[model samples]
Structures are given as C-alpha cells and as structure tokens.
Target: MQLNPESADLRALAKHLYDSYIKSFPLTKAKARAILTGKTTDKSPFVIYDMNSLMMGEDKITPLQEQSKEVAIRIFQGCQFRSVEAVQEITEYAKSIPGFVNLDLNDQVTLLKYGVHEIIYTMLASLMNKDGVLISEGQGFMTREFLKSLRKPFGDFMEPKFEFAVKFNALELDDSDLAIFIAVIILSGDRPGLLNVKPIEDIQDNLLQALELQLKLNHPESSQLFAKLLQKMTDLRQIVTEHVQLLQVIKKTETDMSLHPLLQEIYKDL
Candidate 1:
C-alpha cells in the first residue's frame, strides 16, 4: 500500500488478492455443497481443525485457560487477517480503478474503512462453508459451533458474519463476477462522511456499467443476474451494520473479552 504502484505492481497486487480467495482454497463449488448436505457418503471427508482440546467458551479460567485462550486468539486473529488484508489490498485495487487515487487521501481512506468489511465477507464467500471457513487450506475447517463457543463477546461477534457468508454463497456468483462486484462495492460513495463523493460515484458507475455489460456478455441467459447481485450487496451492508450492534452489546456488558485492534479501527465510528 505504501508504494504508489504502477501497472505491473498493481497487476501483482490485484492477482495476490484474488489468489488469496479462490486459488488458495481447496473447497470446490460442487464439493462445498455436497459436504454440507451430507451427500458425500464417503468417509465424512472433514479433517476438522485440531484446536487442541481446550474447548471454546467453557466459562472462566481453568486448567485449560492458557490453551483455550490461545486457540481463541488464533481464531480471532484469522478474522482480523481477513479484514485487514482486504482493506490493504483495496488500496492497491483502488489505484487500478480509474479515479480512485486521484481523490483526496482522506477520502480514499474513508471509502476504504466503510467498504473493507463489506468486501471481506464478499471475497471470502469462496472459502466459506457450511458452518465456518477453511483455516489452513483443505486440512482444516473452523466450525460455527467452536467459534461462537470461543467466549461470550468474542464468540457472538462472528455469528452475523457467518449468517451472511452462508446466505451470500447461496447466491452462486463466480469468482470473475465477484471481483468486479467487489471493485464496484469498494468504489461506492454512499457511505457517510465522504468528502469527494462525486468522483467516487462516477468511478463506481463506470465499474458497474462495465459490470452490467460483462454480465450480459458473460451470462446471456440470466437477464436479472446483475440486478440481483446488486441487491445482494445491499444485503451484505445490512448484515455488517446489524453486527455493529453486537459490538455495542459487548461494550456494554463486558470488559473481559477484547476485540482485535484492527476490528476496533474498522468499526471505530460506532
């Protein structure tokens, strides 16, 4: 992000973010649903993340407190990685969009803050499975049961995100379409406090216009697909906004469990 990357630099940056989603994941679209639906009668196939036996959310400190918290930390860390990495890559991605970097630096960061979490869930839809996500490639998958069981506040924080992921995947957009969708979503100027809204809006329009044409060319049989995907982006915003309340609930009820510092920055406006 520090480097004002040129064409070759931006291409690599863009490719890195895309690879972070589809290339690195082992779950195929067909197998993802089969494993969830139990159609895969062959050996269960799930390796299940080891997580060391401390059992998440087992009440206060115990003989297992150290190990339990360590695993909890890693789980939270993975999410923080997703959030932070997406935001950082978007800066690089933004530069690829025609007018993104030309906007004020402050405006660039503003759009980034609002759009980062939205895209985090969007791009990760590929890796999201039935209950949770693939942790280390195909070797392990983190379950909703274990995550929400992590601790009172920390655990509940991710439920809505899991809810969104499950539903988003159900929409069935492929990676090519999703990359364009994310670029449009990030370039959005609708978020509050944006100083240079006009340029952002224009950039988003160009991307979407291109997207609309691409959708028509790419999937001629599906007339409503582009419009439907736009609605899904709105659905994504609602999910993330509702979960901000979950953070508020934690701020009120407890000081014991803490949010990752990056999450604090992401939702700091709240």
Candidate 2:
C-alpha cells in the first residue's frame, strides 16, 4: 500500500502507537531510544519475529493481525514527530487493533504485552529507516513522555510501608548496658518504612528495658548508640503517627463521599 509521505494524520498515528508501546513495557525505553539514536546498531533486543504466526492458520483474519498490520504500515511510512508523539500514535493504533475487543481482563493484559513488543519493534525499524540523528532527537522527547505516564503505575506498586518495634532478650547485662542494647537494636533496625506495624508505646517499653541493662553494664558506646537509636525511634514514631492521622482524614473523606466498596475498605483500614 502506498502511503502519502506528507500526511500529518499518519505521522500522528505512528507517534501514538510508539508511546503506548513504551508505556506498557517500560524497560524497553532505553533500548528503543538507543536504536532510534544510533547509539547502538544492535536491533536484537527489541525485535520480535513470528508475533502473528498464531493467527496464520485461520481462513478468517483476526482483528489482532489487522491491527498489527496497520501499525506495521504506519511505522513503514516514517514518523517525524517527537518521541512522545510517536509513542502516543503507536498506542492509539494498537488500541484500534482487532484483537483487543472481547478480551477478558487476564487476556487483555497478555494481549497488551504482545502488542507492545510488536509496536516497539516496528517503531525502532521506522526510526532506523529514517536518518538516525533526527530519530534519536525525537526519541529523547518520547522517552520523557513515556516515563511521565509510567509514574503513577510504578509508584502505586512500589510505595514503602513503615514499621517500628523493640525486642527484649534474656541476657545478663548492667542497667546502663540494657539501655545501650536497645539503642543498638533500634540503630540496626531503623530504616525508611522499616516496620509494617509497630506500636510506639511498645518501642518505648523496650528502650527503657535496654536502658536499665546499660546502667548495669556501664558500657559507654552501647549507651551512646542506644541513645541515638532512641531519638531516631522517636522521630520515626512521630512520623508514623502523622501518617496515621492523615490516613484517618482520608478515610473519613472517602466514607463521607460514599466511595467504592474496595476503596472504602482500603481507606478505612489504611
């Protein structure tokens, strides 16, 4: 099929497709840019052959094949837009592909993976087929846009949960030694979002117990580190308390607003 080289619509479409592909499978962004920019001549990392082989045996053509072909042709026409636009165009085209319809949630996710792989390969080829420098420049913009869209999804999965706690053991030590011992534990255990669930009062009791031990042992460094650990623990406890209060506010608002059942449950329990 002969495509009009000057058509803006086709260019936009290609950009959308490329954007969608990168968003769905983020790890490929660097490789995609490398391929486009001529940073590397290697294409093996992004190419996927025989992606359409499963649909070949049927007498009736599948929607997936049609969609894939449409994207393939668009890539062949060359995309001159920024990388973001290129990726967005690719995404749009992939959505229009036949196989996306009537898919269950699991299958939809699976199909998306396959579609993204094919789209990225086509996009790389399109960029390479054009002058390498221009495509690379465009790729920088595309990479940024794709990353922005990826932010929320990544954050939702990776956000940290904090916890704090103290432990007591049956070892003979001085009163000062006990204080220092607890301090050491806090220092070793303290980290950002370290504990999932630890009560502040419980932590205090444990620290006091350690302090008693430190007094008995007369250990200075252990006492010092223990003191430092206590301070950090206090700071962490306050932070966690603030978070809990904030979470309560959120829960109240969610409840008042009559949010979805699952959301209500999460907010209430958070």
Candidate 3:
C-alpha cells in the first residue's frame, strides 16, 4: 500500500498531541495503563460507554450491555505532556482556581496533577474515537503504507503548526511513557472501518464531574482556583476537538489497501 500526505499529517498531528500532553505528565502512567486494560478497580478520570449501546438506550430499547471502558489509550497519550512545559502551566492554573485556595501546596499539586491527567486523557480519547469511526468507513486509510497506494490528489489547508514551548525541567520517562505517546498517535490516525464507537460529550461530562468533585472537596480558595481550571479545561478541549476535526477531513481522503487479517479485524472494531 502507498502513503498519502494527509496520512503523514495525521501522524504528525498525533505525534504533536502526544508530545504536548502525555510527555509532560509522567506520574500518571501506572494508573493510566491499569485503566486502559481494565485491570484497575479504581474509577478512571473519564469513562466512555459504547456509543451503539447509548443510542439504543435513548430509544427505550434494550441496549447491548457491553462493559463501559475508560479512555485509557488517550490517557496514555496525554501522559506525554508530562515532559512538556504545558504541564506546569496546567499545574499552576489548577492551583489558582478558587475552590483550591485552602489546600496546602502539596495537596494543591496533587489535585492539579489529577485534574490535568483527566482533561488530557478525555480529550485525546474523543479524538481517537472519532478517528476510529472515520477509519471504519473503508474509504479512509490507516498506515502510511496503505495511504500511499491510493494515488489520490490532495491539497493542504496550511494550518498553524502546533508548537509547545518547553518551560519545565526534563524528567526521565519510561516504557509506560512511550506507550502513552504511541497510543495517542495511533488513535488519531485513521483506521478504516472502525466504528464511531464513542462520543465526546460523555467524556467531557465525566471529566467535568470529576473536577467538580475535587473542587467541592477543597477549601474556598481551592474552589476558586478549580473553577478557573475548569474553564481552561473546557477551552483546551475545544481546541483539541477543532484540530481533530481537521485531521478527520484529511483522513477521509485516503484509502486502505492492506490484505492483512489483523488490519481487517482492527477495522471491524472501528
């Protein structure tokens, strides 16, 4: 299979997203993986119920009782942000929120880190789920090799490069770190015939609810800081969504030609 420029762009965007979010937040790894693989009994920062089942329930029909899964893949992706300066910004913002005012510095850091972890993971999961759906269409492509075979003409939108300035000291990242980075990139790239199996709204709501809980538990000053942080989280989520939308359009232009059964099975889930 051949590769397309759009595929390259998706790969690049995925890389950028992972680098910006996951690389900057290394401490969340163990929990992230445990959530992704369904190994953890603890609640995830966000959960995404299968979309097919949710729709069925809306119609008062018996929905498929699939187990609800957290956006573990995206959580891993956002873990890359651990290495970036953006994590510090997120941390500072979290501390400044009103509800967090009375939290000691130590507790404030813990709460902020948790909030950042949830926000990044949930947003990335939304994008990945979107890509999964696009790929399932069979008209879309996954790997660069598959895209290259399509021979389709394309044009560029020339969007601004997503650049993140490193403002924090570097930290040692491990296998879990790398896994989170790769997971986000994989999620962003088109894998044809993947079902649009998840929705963004639920993920957003879950994250907000988590943040609200944290805020409610904090002192008045902490609460104020948290409120601001919530607004920032909402803004960042919108930005990520817009970027993913652009990638989706680009993904729609590629074609998958691989004969691998593994690839086929992957598409079946999309």
Candidate 4:
C-alpha cells in the first residue's frame, strides 16, 4: 500500500481533487485567507449580525420569544439555503473522488446522506474564527455571543458547532489537506449499509496515504498531525450525532418551522 510522495500521478490526483473540493466551499482559499488574516474585518465587505441587539447595542422592545423566533427564522433561512447548495456541491465533490462513482448506487446515496453534514461542518472551519463563522457566502457575520444569546434549542444546537469550528481552525488546514480529508470522510468503509465495503476500503486506504503526504508537506513541524486529524474525524462524527438529534428536536418542537425538502431528504431516515 506504499505510495511515492513525489509521484506525479499522486500529485495530479491531489490537485484535481482539491479543485473539485474548493467548488463546494462558499469561501475559497483566497477569500477565506482574506477573512482569516484580518484582511477582511467585521467592517470590511461584510454585513455583521450580532444577535445580541443585532450586535450594535440597539435596544429591543421584543421579548425573548419574539426575538428568538425572529433570529431563528433568519438563521434557519441561512442554513436551509446553504444546505441546499451544499448537497449539490457535496454530490459533485464525492463523484470526483477516485472510485466513488463505481460504488453501488444505494451505497453512494448512503455515504452522502451520512457524510454531507460532516463535510459541511468541516469546510465551515475555513469561514470561522474564535468569534463566529462567516455565513451567507461571507456576506454576513454571526457572532458567537449572539448565537449564545438565543433561546433553547436554537442556541443550544449552534454553540457546539462554534466550539468545533474554533478548535478545528486551530489545526490550520489548508485547502489541499482539507480536500483529502473530505474525500476521507465520504469514502469511509464503515458507513452503515455499505454493500461493497472492500471497494470503499481500497479508496480510503489511498486517501489516508494521500492525507499523510498532505500533512507532511503542509505541516512539516508537527510529528503527530496525522493522528490528531484522525481524531478530529472521530470528533466530527460525535458532533454529527448531536446535530442530528438536535435537528430532530427542532422538527418536533418547532412545528411551524419549514425545512427545505432536500435537507429533509438527507436527514429523513435518521
């Protein structure tokens, strides 16, 4: 299972894979760099929403329920819009991976069904800071404090994602590393109901090798970066579980809330 680090084929595959991966992100590397490096600030080219009085110190006459419902409607619309686009992007990205299209069709749906949220959350690290993630295609900033201020279910569900994103950003993975990691997530052999586990494992083995190569090339200073990244994948799975349960709770409790059909389809079975 050895791969030459300098092999042209490997390099080309990684490069092609990365280009496909970037198409799925609202913030590409350079744009994300602008935001991450402080080149793009809260005031620069971004509409900021501080859920705490709209983050501008404005006093509100609305009570907590009214305020939370308004905020929920706003962010939920954002989530639904972003998530619909994500499904398409994730499908494209998954299809671009070597051998992904060759799997049994049901298996492909299963993988994407289970894996899309993980990829979305993982890519989200790029748009995030310790403060909060840049939402609406980098058009708006949602403050962590504002997210924290929301009422039960909404705020509770959002805080864990921010926690995960902040910690993930600490790893400082670039586009190439993340490209392979997203591939790794989608190609996992352990996904339930996979009919062709061996084929998926073969792809995963190669992705793992590529990931190790990426970490070494991108972060030569860290000896244990690969192991740490694998741990992040594990952590992402737990976060997905929590997210799924919370969404189910939202569906049950927020009866008037409308969810996009595509979003519903992805999580319907769960």
Candidate 5:
C-alpha cells in the first residue's frame, strides 16, 4: 500500500517515530559539543549512567596500557552496553512502525540483526564530531587520537565509524529525519532470510517515500540531501560488514576482551 505524502496520517506517523527516536537518543550535536567542550554546566540533557568509571567527566578518555589494551576493553565494553540498549530501543521503535510486527518472528530477527548496526551508526552521528565521539551518554569524549593509538586489530574497528559520522554530520539531520530513516532501515526487504519479502518491500517503499518527503520538508535548501542519505545507507551497510570482518580477527587474536552475550547473539551470523 502506498503512503500518502500529503496526508495527515503520514505526518502523524513521522511525529510518532520522531518521538520514539528522541526517547532513546536525546542528545543533539550542539548539546554533545557543549558537554564535550566543557561549555555547559547543566547535565540534564546528558544521562550519567553506570558507565562512569570508564567514561566519566568532560575530558577525553585516554588509553593507559602499552598496547592500549586496557582502554580497548573499556571502550568495547562501553559500546557493548550501548549496543545492547540500542537493540532494545530499535526493537521498540520498530514495533511502533505500522507494519513491522506483523512479519514472521524469524523475519523480524533477521531484519533487526542486519539492521541494528546501521541504526547504531546513524544514531552515532548525533554524539559525534569531526575529531571524536562522546561516550557514556555524553559524560565524556573519546578522541580520534585515542582510538587510533590502540593496537592494530582493535583500532581498525572505530575509525571508519568516526569517518562516516563526520561526513554524516554535515547533513545535519535532526531526530525527525532519522526517525523515518531508521524505520526504512528496519523495514528493508533486502535482508537475507526474510520469509516474507513482499510485505517488507511494501513497508519499506512507503517509509522511503515518507523519508524522501520528510527530507524535502526539512531540508528544502538542499535537494541533494535525500540522495546523500541514500548513499549513506550503503556506506553504513559496508561499515557493518567490515566490522564483522574485524570481529572475526578479534576472535582469532585470542584477546582477553570478552563480548557481551547480547552482542554475540546479534553478531553471530552476520
């Protein structure tokens, strides 16, 4: 079924998705930079969670070990925790989409498994700048230098994300834009193992139409924005593949770092 771009229901759907998106990822780039640069005294916008020890304060987190193994583990653990939370939030957001939950259970899992990383990277754009990313919900900054300083296999993981985020930030997509974009990601018909492709294709087509129209409404000055975002979807997909490849390398290195059970489950097949 085709969605009506000018209909009130479509606008309402976008608003619903935007509200859900904001609940999980509330911080904007301005607030993130304020927190990172020590320019803001208010901490209300930032959620100081249990990850304080690993990423507390406004300073950039630095690696201590000779090979930066200590920082590596801390960063990985922090990411694992956030990614676990991301899975839940993404799942919640997906359910709110009109047609997402009606799919078969295995198809739902397949979509989420392949789509979560893309959503994570998309959300990461909010907490990132040209030089670094914020950690522990904006309580701290993790500089590109620190990530680059890490040992080979571990270092390869985050740099691409930073590169992608830096470029993505230029688009200046707010939560409203990301809401539909993420919905499109989850509703994608292309993921392997989908038992029902036609339904997904229909849903994705509608969402993409909404996204394209949303971009037009939100960023009228730049007609190229929608095309750029489509390109970003491909870029994010490639990033996830490279991340999986790096995970294989990490698995073989016999490192002391441990993957969270949820992370292993998500990263298992793809």
Candidate 6:
C-alpha cells in the first residue's frame, strides 16, 4: 500500500519480495540475460505432438481403430504428464504471493484462467533455447523440428511461443523484471469475471511503480527499457490468445488423448 514514488521503504519490500519470490522457482539473472539476448534459430527443437499420427488422418494411417487408440495413449501420455506437473507447480508459485489465496475460489480460478498459461510461457523463456527447451534438468531436450512435425492444433499451440520467446528474450530482462512481470500478469484486473478488480489493479499498479524504480537502477543505459518490457507483455498476451486456440482444438478432438482436469477447468471458459 505504501508504493508511492517517495517510499524507499515500500520499494525495499518490493525488491526483497522479488528476491524471495523468485527463489520459489528456477530463474536466474545470468540465464535470464542469456536467454533474452540469445538465438535458437540455428538449431531444431522437438514439438510436443506426433507428426506421424496427425498425418495419418488424425488416426492410424492403417485405419486400425485399436492401433490408433494405442498410438493416442503413447504420444499423449507424455503430454499429460508434463502438462499436469507444470500447471501444479506454476500454481504453487502464483499462490506464494500474498493475498492470492485470500480471494474467493471463483476469483482465484479467474486469475489462474487468465494468468497460468502466460506464466508458463514466461518461465518457459528461461528453459528455451534456439534448438528447444532443455527439459528433465538437461537430461532430455525437445527440438524445434519435432514441434513443427506435430498434428495441426497440438503443434500449433506452443509453436508461436518459440517466436515470442526468441524476440522477448532479446529484451535481456533480469530477475527483478521477470518477478514483477509475473505478478503484473497474474494480478490483472481487466480479466473477465474478476470480483475484486480495484484491489488487484491497485496492487498491480503499485508493483509496476515499484518496478520502474528497479528498472532505472538495473538498466541505467536505457530509459526506454521499462516501456519496452511493458510493450512486450502486450505481445505475450496476443500470443496467449493464439495459443488457447490449440486448447480448443484439442478439447474437441480429445479421445484417449485426455488433458489434466485443472487445465480443462481453467480454459473451459474459452
């Protein structure tokens, strides 16, 4: 509440909270800088879906129904595993912030509805590379090539993120930038069906005000970095809009290829 321009005391808490909050996840200043300014175009990253299945009439090319279901279980099993884990972990981080759990269940769902996928991709920036994500703590990796090979809607879901990631990564944001950015995205007041719009808006604006001071200190060379970072968020929102279309398609086509209940619930409004 004391986030006025004059309050160094409030700013200190904002900064301190950022440090403590990011410790709840896997972000780093060095990695953040490297990712935003780095390139992955030279390498191919794997897609999350099976190109072969998609090409086979969205079924088995042999038209064997039993084999098709078998294939469905195979490719989608990994997708379901990764999707469920990511959502739960991401939710944990989001709730670590004060007042997140204070909201009624409905508003909590509303914020997660709007914010979860955005947070996933934002943090995904940290793991992303020109080739693809370094998954399983570097023991495994997904290549850009595999993603392009997936079936229509599934492949389409996250592909745009690579492009957005590459460009947004070009921003070279630090831990502080990402921390406040996630809070800003999650605390959005304009999201449909939100109950406590003014309170969250106040919190978001206060956090933003706090962020400006940090940016000035963090990036003395560029006065424009703050605005550009905010602008990048707008681009991220657009990409999220595009990304959800894939969810819609998957839901329609879903058979044995099931999604997590939480994911299904969050995107149900769409």
Off by over 4 Å in 2: 1-223, 255-270
Alpha carbon deviation, residue 101, candidate 4 (Å): 0.8
Model 5, position 97: C-alpha lDDT score: 86
Best by TM-score: 4
Model 3 C-alpha lDDT per residue in residues 1-270, reported as the tens digit of each score: 135774454344334434444444443444444544556665422322343433343233112221222222122222243324445645543332223334344444444433444344432332121112111111121222222222222111111111100100011222322323222222221222323313322323433443343334333343354444434434444555664565576456422322233476789999
lDDT (tens digit, per residue) of candidate 1 on 1-270: 133434344444345434544543344445555655657653343444335533331221123433333455545555566566556666666666667788988888888888877876776666677667654333345677777776566777667767777777766766556666777887878887888789888878766766665566567666788878898888888877876776577557533443454466688877
- Ranking of models by TM-score: 4, 5, 6, 1, 3, 2
TM-score for every candidate vs. truth? 0.67, 0.20, 0.22, 0.82, 0.80, 0.71
Each model's lDDT comes to 0.63, 0.34, 0.34, 0.76, 0.76, 0.65
For model 2, residues 140-209, the per-residue Cα lDDT tens digits are: 2222222222222221210111112111111213222322332223222223333322342344354454
Sorting all predicted structures by lDDT, with the top scorer first, yields 4, 5, 6, 1, 2, 3
Give the deviation of candidate 5 from the true structure as CA RMSD. Answer: 8.6
Instruction: Say what the RMSD of model 2 is.
Output: 27.0
TM-score computed on alpha carbons, candidate 2: 0.20
Q: Model 6 over residues 41-153: C-alpha lDDT tens digits? A: 33332233344423442322122442434333444455556656777766776676666677767887888887877877887777776776655433234566666655555
Model 2: per-residue Cα lDDT at residue 221: 42
Clashes of each: 0, 48, 51, 0, 0, 13
TM-score of 1: 0.67
Clashing pairs in 5: none
